[PDB]
Design a binder for this molecule. Structure first.
Ligand SMILES: CCCCCCCCCCCC(=O)O
Ligand SMILES: CCCCCCCCCCCC(=O)O
Ligand SMILES: [K+]
Length: 203
Protein backbone atom coordinates (compact mmCIF):
# COMPACT_ATOMS: atom_id res chain seq x y z
CA UNK A 1 0.00 0.00 0.00
CA UNK A 2 1.18 3.48 -0.97
CA UNK A 3 2.80 5.70 1.63
CA UNK A 4 1.55 9.27 1.97
CA UNK A 5 3.82 12.12 2.97
CA UNK A 6 1.52 13.80 5.56
CA UNK A 7 2.50 17.47 5.23
CA UNK A 8 2.08 17.56 1.44
CA UNK A 9 -0.33 14.67 0.91
CA UNK A 10 1.80 13.26 -1.91
CA UNK A 11 1.75 9.48 -2.33
CA UNK A 12 4.62 7.07 -2.98
CA UNK A 13 4.23 3.39 -3.92
CA UNK A 14 5.50 0.92 -1.30
CA UNK A 15 7.67 -0.60 -4.02
CA UNK A 16 8.68 -0.22 -7.65
CA UNK A 17 8.93 -3.33 -9.80
CA UNK A 18 8.39 -5.66 -6.83
CA UNK A 19 12.13 -5.51 -6.09
CA UNK A 20 12.71 -1.88 -5.10
CA UNK A 21 11.30 -1.08 -1.66
CA UNK A 22 10.43 2.36 -0.32
CA UNK A 23 12.49 2.81 2.85
CA UNK A 24 12.10 6.50 3.62
CA UNK A 25 10.01 9.53 2.70
CA UNK A 26 10.95 13.15 3.31
CA UNK A 27 10.73 16.79 2.26
CA UNK A 28 13.38 18.99 0.64
CA UNK A 29 12.87 22.51 1.93
CA UNK A 30 14.32 25.93 1.18
CA UNK A 31 15.05 28.15 4.17
CA UNK A 32 14.10 31.74 3.48
CA UNK A 33 14.66 34.80 5.66
CA UNK A 34 13.50 34.62 9.27
CA UNK A 35 10.59 32.28 10.01
CA UNK A 36 9.92 31.80 6.31
CA UNK A 37 10.38 28.37 4.74
CA UNK A 38 9.18 26.64 1.59
CA UNK A 39 8.53 22.96 0.90
CA UNK A 40 10.13 22.44 -2.52
CA UNK A 41 9.47 18.75 -3.15
CA UNK A 42 8.70 15.47 -1.41
CA UNK A 43 10.98 12.51 -2.03
CA UNK A 44 10.96 8.77 -1.50
CA UNK A 45 14.09 6.65 -1.25
CA UNK A 46 13.95 3.10 -2.65
CA UNK A 47 16.53 0.30 -2.43
CA UNK A 48 16.69 -3.11 -4.13
CA UNK A 49 15.95 -5.80 -1.55
CA UNK A 50 18.36 -8.43 -2.86
CA UNK A 51 21.23 -5.93 -3.10
CA UNK A 52 20.70 -4.82 0.50
CA UNK A 53 20.43 -8.42 1.71
CA UNK A 54 23.74 -9.25 0.03
CA UNK A 55 25.56 -6.27 1.57
CA UNK A 56 24.31 -7.14 5.06
CA UNK A 57 25.06 -10.82 4.57
CA UNK A 58 28.60 -10.03 3.48
CA UNK A 59 29.61 -7.21 5.83
CA UNK A 60 27.26 -7.83 8.77
CA UNK A 61 26.91 -11.61 8.86
CA UNK A 62 24.87 -13.06 11.73
CA UNK A 63 24.19 -9.67 13.27
CA UNK A 64 20.71 -8.56 14.38
CA UNK A 65 19.12 -5.43 12.89
CA UNK A 66 19.78 -3.37 16.03
CA UNK A 67 23.50 -4.15 15.87
CA UNK A 68 23.68 -3.47 12.14
CA UNK A 69 21.97 -0.11 12.65
CA UNK A 70 24.16 0.53 15.69
CA UNK A 71 27.27 0.42 13.50
CA UNK A 72 28.47 3.90 12.58
CA UNK A 73 29.83 2.40 9.36
CA UNK A 74 26.42 1.15 8.14
CA UNK A 75 25.37 4.34 6.37
CA UNK A 76 28.61 4.66 4.37
CA UNK A 77 28.69 0.93 3.62
CA UNK A 78 25.20 1.15 2.07
CA UNK A 79 26.00 4.21 -0.04
CA UNK A 80 29.26 2.77 -1.38
CA UNK A 81 27.88 -0.69 -2.13
CA UNK A 82 26.60 -1.65 -5.57
CA UNK A 83 22.97 -1.35 -4.52
CA UNK A 84 20.31 -0.33 -7.05
CA UNK A 85 18.32 2.59 -5.71
CA UNK A 86 15.70 5.09 -6.79
CA UNK A 87 15.04 8.60 -5.50
CA UNK A 88 11.58 9.72 -6.60
CA UNK A 89 10.93 13.45 -6.39
CA UNK A 90 7.46 15.00 -6.59
CA UNK A 91 7.39 18.79 -6.97
CA UNK A 92 5.43 20.56 -4.24
CA UNK A 93 6.16 24.29 -4.72
CA UNK A 94 4.14 25.65 -7.63
CA UNK A 95 6.22 28.69 -8.59
CA UNK A 96 9.64 27.25 -9.44
CA UNK A 97 11.53 28.68 -12.41
CA UNK A 98 14.00 26.61 -14.44
CA UNK A 99 16.88 29.06 -13.92
CA UNK A 100 16.50 29.11 -10.14
CA UNK A 101 16.27 25.32 -10.02
CA UNK A 102 19.38 24.80 -12.15
CA UNK A 103 21.40 27.09 -9.90
CA UNK A 104 20.07 25.24 -6.85
CA UNK A 105 21.03 21.71 -7.87
CA UNK A 106 24.33 22.90 -9.32
CA UNK A 107 25.14 24.21 -5.84
CA UNK A 108 23.90 21.20 -3.84
CA UNK A 109 25.30 18.56 -6.18
CA UNK A 110 28.38 20.72 -6.74
CA UNK A 111 29.03 21.02 -2.99
CA UNK A 112 29.02 17.22 -2.77
CA UNK A 113 31.16 16.61 -5.86
CA UNK A 114 34.00 18.74 -4.47
CA UNK A 115 33.49 17.08 -1.10
CA UNK A 116 34.10 13.60 -2.53
CA UNK A 117 35.98 14.09 -5.79
CA UNK A 118 38.83 15.81 -7.58
CA UNK A 119 39.02 19.59 -7.30
CA UNK A 120 37.73 19.81 -10.89
CA UNK A 121 34.40 18.11 -11.58
CA UNK A 122 33.00 20.99 -13.61
CA UNK A 123 32.59 18.74 -16.66
CA UNK A 124 31.00 16.01 -14.57
CA UNK A 125 28.54 18.51 -13.09
CA UNK A 126 27.86 19.79 -16.60
CA UNK A 127 27.03 16.30 -17.87
CA UNK A 128 24.37 16.16 -15.14
CA UNK A 129 23.03 19.63 -15.91
CA UNK A 130 22.77 18.77 -19.62
CA UNK A 131 20.26 16.04 -18.77
CA UNK A 132 17.71 18.80 -18.17
CA UNK A 133 18.69 21.05 -21.08
CA UNK A 134 15.31 20.53 -22.79
CA UNK A 135 13.13 21.37 -19.79
CA UNK A 136 11.42 24.76 -19.81
CA UNK A 137 9.05 24.33 -16.87
CA UNK A 138 8.95 22.38 -13.60
CA UNK A 139 5.35 22.59 -12.31
CA UNK A 140 3.85 21.28 -9.09
CA UNK A 141 3.09 17.54 -9.24
CA UNK A 142 5.93 16.83 -11.69
CA UNK A 143 7.70 13.54 -10.91
CA UNK A 144 11.44 12.99 -11.39
CA UNK A 145 13.09 9.62 -10.87
CA UNK A 146 16.82 9.51 -10.14
CA UNK A 147 18.09 5.95 -10.28
CA UNK A 148 21.35 4.24 -9.42
CA UNK A 149 21.58 1.48 -12.02
CA UNK A 150 24.17 -1.35 -11.92
CA UNK A 151 27.78 -0.25 -12.33
CA UNK A 152 27.04 3.03 -10.58
CA UNK A 153 25.24 4.51 -13.58
CA UNK A 154 22.99 7.47 -12.77
CA UNK A 155 19.79 7.54 -14.82
CA UNK A 156 17.10 10.22 -14.83
CA UNK A 157 13.47 10.02 -15.89
CA UNK A 158 11.05 12.95 -15.93
CA UNK A 159 7.29 12.34 -15.91
CA UNK A 160 8.01 8.72 -16.80
CA UNK A 161 10.30 9.53 -19.72
CA UNK A 162 13.98 8.57 -19.56
CA UNK A 163 16.11 11.62 -20.36
CA UNK A 164 19.63 10.25 -20.07
CA UNK A 165 22.32 8.64 -17.96
CA UNK A 166 25.79 9.36 -16.61
CA UNK A 167 28.17 6.58 -15.61
CA UNK A 168 30.00 7.94 -12.57
CA UNK A 169 30.57 6.43 -9.15
CA UNK A 170 31.33 9.95 -7.92
CA UNK A 171 28.09 11.48 -9.20
CA UNK A 172 25.97 8.63 -7.83
CA UNK A 173 27.60 8.95 -4.42
CA UNK A 174 27.25 12.74 -4.37
CA UNK A 175 23.56 12.81 -5.26
CA UNK A 176 22.62 10.01 -2.84
CA UNK A 177 24.58 11.75 -0.08
CA UNK A 178 22.12 14.65 -0.22
CA UNK A 179 19.32 12.33 0.86
CA UNK A 180 20.96 9.62 2.99
CA UNK A 181 24.27 11.17 4.04
CA UNK A 182 25.62 12.89 7.15
CA UNK A 183 23.92 16.21 6.35
CA UNK A 184 20.64 15.22 4.57
CA UNK A 185 17.74 17.35 3.39
CA UNK A 186 15.51 15.53 5.87
CA UNK A 187 17.03 13.82 8.90
CA UNK A 188 13.80 12.01 9.77
CA UNK A 189 13.77 10.49 6.28
CA UNK A 190 17.37 9.34 6.65
CA UNK A 191 16.70 7.71 10.02
CA UNK A 192 13.70 5.84 8.62
CA UNK A 193 15.78 4.77 5.63
CA UNK A 194 18.57 3.36 7.79
CA UNK A 195 16.12 1.74 10.21
CA UNK A 196 14.24 0.03 7.38
CA UNK A 197 17.37 -0.84 5.39
CA UNK A 198 18.66 -2.59 8.51
CA UNK A 199 15.39 -4.53 8.80
CA UNK A 200 15.02 -5.30 5.09
CA UNK A 201 17.44 -8.23 5.21
CA UNK A 202 15.14 -10.07 7.63
CA UNK A 203 11.89 -9.96 5.64
C1 LIG B 1 14.33 19.93 -8.26
C2 LIG B 1 15.38 20.80 -7.60
C3 LIG B 1 14.78 21.59 -6.45
C4 LIG B 1 15.76 22.64 -5.92
C5 LIG B 1 15.24 24.05 -6.19
C6 LIG B 1 15.23 24.89 -4.92
C7 LIG B 1 15.25 26.38 -5.27
C8 LIG B 1 14.51 27.20 -4.22
C9 LIG B 1 13.41 28.03 -4.85
C10 LIG B 1 13.44 29.47 -4.34
C11 LIG B 1 12.24 29.75 -3.44
C12 LIG B 1 11.64 31.10 -3.78
O1 LIG B 1 10.85 31.17 -4.75
O2 LIG B 1 11.96 32.09 -3.08
C1 LIG C 1 13.48 20.79 -14.88
C2 LIG C 1 13.83 19.53 -14.11
C3 LIG C 1 14.80 19.84 -12.98
C4 LIG C 1 14.97 18.63 -12.07
C5 LIG C 1 16.36 18.64 -11.43
C6 LIG C 1 16.58 17.40 -10.59
C7 LIG C 1 17.90 17.51 -9.84
C8 LIG C 1 17.95 16.54 -8.66
C9 LIG C 1 18.90 17.05 -7.57
C10 LIG C 1 18.22 18.10 -6.68
C11 LIG C 1 19.04 18.37 -5.43
C12 LIG C 1 18.45 19.54 -4.68
O1 LIG C 1 17.33 19.39 -4.12
O2 LIG C 1 19.09 20.62 -4.64
K1 LIG D 1 13.96 30.23 7.51
Amino acid sequence: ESVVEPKTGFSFPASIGDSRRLLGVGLRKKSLLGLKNIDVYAFGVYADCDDVKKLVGDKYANLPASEIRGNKSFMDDLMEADIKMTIRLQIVYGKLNIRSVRNAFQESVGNRLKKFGGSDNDELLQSFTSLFKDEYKIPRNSTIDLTKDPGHVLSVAIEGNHVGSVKSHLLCRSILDLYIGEEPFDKNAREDFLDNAASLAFD
